[PDB]
Short mmCIF file of C-alpha atoms in Angstrom, two decimals:
data_model
loop_
_atom_site.label_atom_id
_atom_site.label_comp_id
_atom_site.label_asym_id
_atom_site.label_seq_id
_atom_site.Cartn_x
_atom_site.Cartn_y
_atom_site.Cartn_z
CA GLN A 282 20.00 -38.46 58.95
CA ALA A 283 16.92 -37.61 61.02
CA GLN A 284 18.82 -36.03 63.93
CA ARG A 285 21.05 -34.18 61.43
CA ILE A 286 18.23 -32.16 59.86
CA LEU A 287 16.52 -31.85 63.26
CA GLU A 288 19.38 -30.03 65.01
CA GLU A 289 20.04 -28.00 61.84
CA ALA A 290 16.65 -26.28 61.94
CA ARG A 291 16.74 -26.04 65.76
CA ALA A 292 19.77 -23.75 65.46
CA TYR A 293 18.00 -21.23 63.21
CA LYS A 294 15.10 -21.18 65.68
CA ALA A 295 17.50 -20.59 68.58
CA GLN A 296 19.29 -17.80 66.68
CA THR A 297 16.01 -15.96 66.05
CA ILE A 298 15.02 -16.17 69.73
CA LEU A 299 18.46 -14.98 70.85
CA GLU A 300 18.51 -12.19 68.27
CA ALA A 301 14.96 -11.18 69.20
CA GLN A 302 15.83 -11.10 72.92
CA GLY A 303 18.83 -8.82 72.35
CA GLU A 304 16.86 -6.35 70.23
CA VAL A 305 14.05 -6.39 72.81
CA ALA A 306 16.51 -5.67 75.62
CA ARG A 307 18.00 -2.75 73.68
CA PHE A 308 14.61 -1.15 73.02
CA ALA A 309 13.62 -1.81 76.64
CA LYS A 310 16.38 0.16 78.39
CA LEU A 311 16.00 2.94 75.80
CA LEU A 312 12.22 3.39 76.18
CA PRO A 313 12.37 5.13 79.62
CA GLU A 314 15.04 7.52 78.32
CA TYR A 315 12.80 8.56 75.42
CA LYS A 316 9.84 9.13 77.75
CA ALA A 317 12.03 11.35 79.94
CA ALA A 318 13.07 13.66 77.07
CA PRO A 319 11.03 12.81 73.94
CA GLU A 320 11.81 15.97 71.97
CA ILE A 321 15.55 15.92 72.73
CA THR A 322 15.87 12.21 71.90
CA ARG A 323 13.80 12.63 68.72
CA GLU A 324 15.99 15.48 67.46
CA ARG A 325 19.26 13.68 68.28
CA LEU A 326 18.28 10.37 66.64
CA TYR A 327 16.68 12.24 63.72
CA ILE A 328 19.81 14.27 62.98
CA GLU A 329 22.16 11.33 63.65
CA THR A 330 20.24 9.17 61.18
CA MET A 331 19.86 11.98 58.64
CA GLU A 332 23.58 12.79 58.59
CA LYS A 333 24.39 9.12 57.93
CA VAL A 334 22.02 8.67 54.98
CA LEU A 335 22.82 12.01 53.32
CA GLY A 336 26.51 11.33 53.97
CA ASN A 337 26.62 8.85 51.07
CA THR A 338 23.67 9.41 48.71
CA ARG A 339 24.31 12.16 46.18
CA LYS A 340 22.07 15.23 46.30
CA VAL A 341 20.88 17.93 43.91
CA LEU A 342 19.59 20.73 46.19
CA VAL A 343 17.56 22.35 43.37
CA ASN A 344 14.67 24.75 43.89
CA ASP A 345 11.04 23.65 43.68
CA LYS A 346 8.21 24.94 41.39
CA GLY A 347 9.90 23.50 38.26
CA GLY A 348 8.80 20.01 37.21
CA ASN A 349 11.55 18.72 34.88
CA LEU A 350 14.42 16.24 35.34
CA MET A 351 16.34 13.43 33.61
CA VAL A 352 16.86 10.28 35.71
CA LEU A 353 19.40 9.00 33.14
CA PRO A 354 19.59 5.38 34.40
CA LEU A 355 21.61 2.48 33.00
CA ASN B 225 29.51 -57.42 4.04
CA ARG B 226 26.03 -58.74 4.90
CA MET B 227 27.29 -60.89 7.79
CA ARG B 228 29.25 -57.97 9.26
CA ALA B 229 26.23 -55.65 9.11
CA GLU B 230 23.75 -58.05 10.76
CA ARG B 231 26.28 -59.00 13.45
CA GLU B 232 27.25 -55.36 14.03
CA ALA B 233 23.56 -54.42 14.30
CA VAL B 234 22.87 -57.10 16.93
CA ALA B 235 25.98 -55.93 18.81
CA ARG B 236 24.84 -52.29 18.85
CA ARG B 237 21.34 -53.49 19.77
CA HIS B 238 22.67 -55.44 22.76
CA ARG B 239 24.76 -52.43 23.76
CA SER B 240 21.76 -50.08 23.48
CA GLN B 241 19.41 -52.25 25.57
CA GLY B 242 21.80 -51.91 28.51
CA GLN B 243 21.96 -48.13 28.03
CA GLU B 244 18.22 -47.63 28.58
CA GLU B 245 18.24 -49.77 31.75
CA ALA B 246 21.07 -47.56 33.04
CA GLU B 247 19.07 -44.36 32.46
CA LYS B 248 15.99 -45.94 34.06
CA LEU B 249 17.92 -46.84 37.21
CA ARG B 250 19.55 -43.39 37.11
CA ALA B 251 16.16 -41.66 37.04
CA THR B 252 14.93 -43.82 39.93
CA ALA B 253 17.84 -42.58 42.05
CA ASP B 254 16.95 -38.95 41.27
CA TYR B 255 13.37 -39.40 42.50
CA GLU B 256 14.33 -40.95 45.85
CA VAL B 257 17.05 -38.37 46.62
CA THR B 258 14.60 -35.53 45.88
CA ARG B 259 11.99 -37.17 48.12
CA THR B 260 14.41 -37.21 51.07
CA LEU B 261 15.54 -33.64 50.30
CA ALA B 262 11.92 -32.45 50.26
CA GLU B 263 11.14 -34.50 53.38
CA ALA B 264 13.95 -32.70 55.21
CA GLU B 265 12.76 -29.30 53.94
CA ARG B 266 9.32 -30.03 55.40
CA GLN B 267 10.71 -30.71 58.88
CA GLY B 268 12.82 -27.56 58.61
CA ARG B 269 9.89 -25.24 57.89
CA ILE B 270 7.97 -26.74 60.84
CA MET B 271 10.80 -25.86 63.22
CA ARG B 272 11.63 -22.65 61.33
CA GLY B 273 8.03 -21.52 61.88
CA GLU B 274 8.01 -22.15 65.63
CA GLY B 275 11.03 -19.83 65.78
CA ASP B 276 9.49 -16.72 64.27
CA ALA B 277 6.12 -17.60 65.79
CA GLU B 278 7.70 -17.75 69.25
CA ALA B 279 9.66 -14.54 68.69
CA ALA B 280 6.56 -12.76 67.35
CA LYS B 281 5.11 -12.74 70.86
CA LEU B 282 8.28 -11.11 72.23
CA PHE B 283 8.18 -8.36 69.60
CA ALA B 284 4.44 -7.78 70.09
CA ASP B 285 4.24 -7.59 73.90
CA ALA B 286 7.54 -5.69 74.14
CA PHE B 287 6.79 -3.08 71.46
CA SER B 288 3.10 -2.88 72.46
CA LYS B 289 4.08 -0.27 75.10
CA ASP B 290 4.68 2.54 72.58
CA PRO B 291 4.04 1.75 68.88
CA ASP B 292 4.76 5.29 67.62
CA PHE B 293 8.13 5.32 69.39
CA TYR B 294 9.07 1.86 68.09
CA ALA B 295 8.08 2.98 64.59
CA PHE B 296 10.48 5.93 64.85
CA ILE B 297 13.50 3.91 66.02
CA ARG B 298 12.91 1.07 63.54
CA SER B 299 12.02 3.29 60.56
CA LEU B 300 15.22 5.31 61.04
CA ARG B 301 17.37 2.15 60.99
CA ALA B 302 15.71 1.03 57.73
CA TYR B 303 16.72 4.26 55.97
CA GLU B 304 20.39 3.87 56.98
CA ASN B 305 20.37 0.33 55.56
CA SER B 306 18.33 1.13 52.44
CA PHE B 307 20.41 4.17 51.40
CA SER B 308 23.72 2.58 52.54
CA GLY B 309 24.88 2.11 48.95
CA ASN B 310 25.97 5.12 46.91
CA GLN B 311 23.50 4.39 44.10
CA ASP B 312 20.82 7.01 44.90
CA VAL B 313 20.27 10.70 44.17
CA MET B 314 18.21 12.59 46.77
CA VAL B 315 16.83 15.64 44.95
CA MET B 316 15.82 17.73 47.96
CA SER B 317 14.67 21.36 48.00
CA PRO B 318 16.28 24.34 49.78
CA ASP B 319 12.99 24.85 51.67
CA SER B 320 13.21 21.30 53.13
CA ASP B 321 12.68 21.12 56.88
CA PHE B 322 16.05 19.42 57.45
CA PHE B 323 17.65 22.51 55.83
CA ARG B 324 15.76 24.89 58.14
CA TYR B 325 19.11 25.98 59.64
CA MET B 326 20.63 26.97 56.28
CA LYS B 327 18.73 30.30 56.02
CA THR B 328 20.34 33.45 57.52
CA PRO B 329 19.40 33.76 61.23
CA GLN C 263 25.96 -49.00 3.51
CA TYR C 264 23.52 -46.08 3.87
CA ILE C 265 20.71 -48.60 4.42
CA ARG C 266 22.74 -50.53 7.01
CA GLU C 267 23.81 -47.26 8.64
CA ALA C 268 20.23 -45.95 8.64
CA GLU C 269 19.02 -49.14 10.35
CA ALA C 270 21.57 -48.62 13.13
CA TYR C 271 20.43 -45.00 13.64
CA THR C 272 16.75 -45.99 13.81
CA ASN C 273 17.49 -48.94 16.11
CA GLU C 274 19.87 -46.87 18.27
CA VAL C 275 17.50 -43.95 18.96
CA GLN C 276 14.61 -46.31 19.93
CA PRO C 277 15.96 -47.42 23.37
CA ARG C 278 17.30 -43.87 23.81
CA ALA C 279 13.78 -42.42 23.85
CA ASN C 280 12.49 -45.07 26.28
CA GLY C 281 15.06 -43.98 28.86
CA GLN C 282 14.29 -40.30 28.27
CA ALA C 283 10.57 -41.02 28.69
CA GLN C 284 10.98 -42.75 32.07
CA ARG C 285 13.02 -39.77 33.31
CA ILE C 286 10.26 -37.33 32.29
CA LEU C 287 7.66 -39.38 34.17
CA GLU C 288 9.92 -39.70 37.23
CA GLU C 289 10.63 -35.96 37.18
CA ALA C 290 6.88 -35.27 37.23
CA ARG C 291 6.41 -37.50 40.28
CA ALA C 292 9.23 -35.66 42.07
CA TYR C 293 7.59 -32.30 41.34
CA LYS C 294 4.21 -33.57 42.58
CA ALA C 295 5.73 -35.08 45.73
CA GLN C 296 7.98 -32.06 46.36
CA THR C 297 5.10 -29.63 45.76
CA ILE C 298 2.84 -31.42 48.27
CA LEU C 299 5.59 -31.47 50.90
CA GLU C 300 6.39 -27.78 50.34
CA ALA C 301 2.74 -26.87 51.00
CA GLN C 302 2.68 -28.69 54.36
CA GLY C 303 5.75 -26.81 55.61
CA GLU C 304 4.52 -23.42 54.41
CA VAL C 305 1.00 -24.10 55.72
CA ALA C 306 2.35 -25.11 59.15
CA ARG C 307 4.40 -21.89 59.30
CA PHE C 308 1.33 -19.79 58.44
CA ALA C 309 -0.76 -21.58 61.09
CA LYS C 310 1.79 -20.94 63.86
CA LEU C 311 2.11 -17.26 62.89
CA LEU C 312 -1.68 -16.69 62.66
CA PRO C 313 -2.49 -16.57 66.43
CA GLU C 314 0.39 -14.14 67.01
CA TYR C 315 -1.07 -11.73 64.43
#
């Protein structure tokens, strides 16, 4: 009973720590690379991320200066 | 018909007295189980807090080297996850910076 | 018959309500107890996180 719920929570805590460590280690090794070439890394990541998001979400590509639209939700 | 009625009434009465005792005992069980369930939930939060509280120091000291850079990496990830589903409509403009390389060189 | 039947109905419902009443009271205690316990956990979590912030 007692031990049961004790170890149960303890696992979540351990998972967080382990997950945190991994993410930290990834951002660690990558930080010096960014400092070496900030502009090049920024452009690469920026385009890589942008192509992924726009790859799925629909787009209009309509010209500005006209303020009218119909969201048409459901 | 009078004897039947009075006897039948007493019978139903005796049956009904037992029924309320049953419910009373039933409700008592509910209380105690909930107590234990809540008790367990309390111990879980305690440990579940230590987890994020311990990890918060790792995130802070690690990312405290370059906040702007960490904001870029993290913020980009968020977009990929937020717009993952095909349930959005990005009404961009042709003048948009990302479309800077769509105008005749 | 109606009279005899009516008596049964009146008699029958009476212990029925008593049971239902005890449950209500017990449910309130559970809420109170559960609420108090929930606060402790949440409070503890907040306390631990506060120095990190």
